[PDB]
Amino acid sequence: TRQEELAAARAALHDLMTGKRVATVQKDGRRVEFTATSVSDLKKYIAELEVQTGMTQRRRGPAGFYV
Amino acid sequence: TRQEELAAARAALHDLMTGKRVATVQKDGRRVEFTATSVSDLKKYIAELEVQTGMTQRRRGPAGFYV
Amino acid sequence: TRQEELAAARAALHDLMTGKRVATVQKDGRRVEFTATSVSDLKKYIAELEVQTGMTQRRRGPAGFYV
Amino acid sequence: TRQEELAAARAALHDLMTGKRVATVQKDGRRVEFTATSVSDLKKYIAELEVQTGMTQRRRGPAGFYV
Amino acid sequence: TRQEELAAARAALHDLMTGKRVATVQKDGRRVEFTATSVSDLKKYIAELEVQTGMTQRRRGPAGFYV
Amino acid sequence: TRQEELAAARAALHDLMTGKRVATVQKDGRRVEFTATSVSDLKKYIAELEVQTGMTQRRRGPAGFYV
Amino acid sequence: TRQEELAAARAALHDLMTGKRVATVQKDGRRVEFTATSVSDLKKYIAELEVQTGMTQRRRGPAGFYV
Amino acid sequence: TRQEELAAARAALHDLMTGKRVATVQKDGRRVEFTATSVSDLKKYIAELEVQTGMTQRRRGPAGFYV
Amino acid sequence: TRQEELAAARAALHDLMTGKRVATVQKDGRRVEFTATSVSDLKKYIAELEVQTGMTQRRRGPAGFYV
Amino acid sequence: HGGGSGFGGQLRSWNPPSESVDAALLPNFT
């Protein structure tokens, strides 16, 4: 249960980024809201889980120099 | 109870990251709110309990240097 | 009775930082809200209470060196 | 009569730190608010009162050194 | 009046420390509040008043150093 | 009138320190509030009033040294 | 009008210090408020208007030194 | 037409210092709020207007030194 | 049209400095409010518009020295 | 003059008990 976690996190990130992350909803006697999370830490979390799971290669090992 | 503590903390962190940590709920005269903890503090908590528990190696000890 | 209150406190910390620290509770004409506290203070309180109570070993005298 | 005040103060510390200090109670048409002190000054008061009262030893005199 | 005034001030300090410094009080239609002071100012007021009054001292000379 | 002004200042400071300065009063149709002065400002004002009035010595001059 | 202006200003200053710098006056249907001023600025305004006024000695010229 | 401006500004400063610079006015349906100024800029305006107007000698320049 | 708005701005500055720049006005569901400015920007605007228009000299060009 | 009190009091409370050399040595000789 990791790939669907990654997909849900990416979808939520996109929704928050554009316009879609609903903060609060009000109906007649129904006030329900969810605390928002910063995009920076959301990106850190999604990157961490992506590199933790069996996903492909994204990071590289430093960089050597040669004349 | 450490295992279900692990599971609950992981699920709570995931839902808070995505969309699903409700601050308050209101029902036409029945509204209750909950204190929101920092994402960094939640990360520290989950890491501390995970390393305390019997889960396998997550971090090793320093790193040697050889020529 | 240190153990009882220590266990209650740690369970309260877990519940509060996961999802369930009731800040305020409302009825029709009944409002009751409790004071809120940070997490670092209660964490260090738990640490000091555990160390002052006769629990298992948790801290060790510095760390020496040798060639 | 310092002992009873110390007991009251430590109980207040416990309940405030966990969940059980009400900042204010609002019965319908009958409401009252109490000033919320911090945990820092509260434990300062705890320390000063417990050291001025003739309870057990809590702290000693510096620390010697020997080869 | 100094002695009973000091006793009342100490009692008020204890009440504020624990739970009893009433910030505001309201009944149907009638509402008042009392401006709340800090803790350090109150305790230093207590200290200076206890010093200036004629009861037993708590302050001595600076120090003495002898080999 | 300096002496009674000083007495009023002393009583006001005592009320402020303990519990007894009203920030506002309300009578469901009539309500009035007052600005809250700083405790340090009140102390400075009462001290300068004590010095200026015909009160006896409170503060001496600078202390000289002798061997 | 310097004398009565000074007297009114000083009385207002004393009232503000003690208990009765009314910030707002509210009767049902009619609510007004006056602006709130600092204390140090009022004190220095009092001092400068005094030294402008032909009142008694209030200041001196630097200070002299002699062995 | 500057002397009457000076008189009006001085009166405004006096009443603002004492008690009488109204911020809001409410009559059960009609409300007027006036912008809040400060004291520093007000006395700067007083000084600039008094020096520009036909006000008499109030300010002198540098200083001489002699033995 | 320069002197007209010069005088208008000067009068507005005098009003704001004295007491009655209307921040907002309301009467039975007819509420409007006007944005506020700062005295510094208003004065510099006055100065620059005065320079732009044909008002007499107010500022000059440095000042030479001579023994 | 200099032995009176000192500058601004200064050594106003230092007054050695003028005494014999034996009276200075013998009491704490050992």
The CATH superfamily label of chain A reads Head-to-tail joining protein W
Number of helices of chain J: 1
Gyration radius of chain A, in Å: 18 Å
* Shape type of chain A: elongated
Q: Based on the coordinates given, report the CATH architecture of chain A.
A: 2-Layer Sandwich
Oligomeric grouping of the chains: part of a larger assembly
**Shape, per Cα inertia axes of chain J:** elongated
Largest β sheet strand count, sense and barrel closure of chain A: 2 strands, antiparallel
Q: Which structural category fits the helices and strands of chain A?
A: alpha+beta
Report helical residue fraction of chain J.
Answer: 10-25%
Beta-strand residue percentage of chain J = under 5%
Family (chain J): Belongs to the siphoviridae portal protein family.
Subcellular location (chain J): Virion
Subunit structure (chain J): Homododecamer. Interacts with the terminase complex composed of two small and one large terminase subunits.
Protein name (chain J): Portal protein B
Description:
The structure is cut from a larger assembly and holds 9 copies of chain A (67 residues) and 1 copy of chain J (30 residues). Chain A has helices spanning 3-18, 39-52, and strands spanning 24-27, 30-34. With 67 residues, chain A is α+β, with helices and mostly antiparallel strands. Chain A has one domain (1-57): Head-to-tail joining protein W, gpW (2-Layer Sandwich), CATH 3.30.1580. Chain A starts with a helix and ends in a 15-residue tail after the last helix. The longest helix of chain J is centred in the last third of the chain and has 5 residues, at 21-25. With 30 residues, chain J is mainly alpha-helical. Helix content of chain J is 17%, strand content 0%. Chain J starts with 20 loop residues before the first helix and ends in a 5-residue tail after the last helix. Classes of the chains: A alpha+beta (67), J mainly alpha (30). Chains C and D meet through helix 1, strand 2 and helix 2 of C and helix 1 and strand 1 of D. Strand 2 of chain D pairs antiparallel with strand 1 of chain E. Chain J: Homododecamer. Interacts with the terminase complex composed of two small and one large terminase subunits. Chain J: It is found in: Virion.
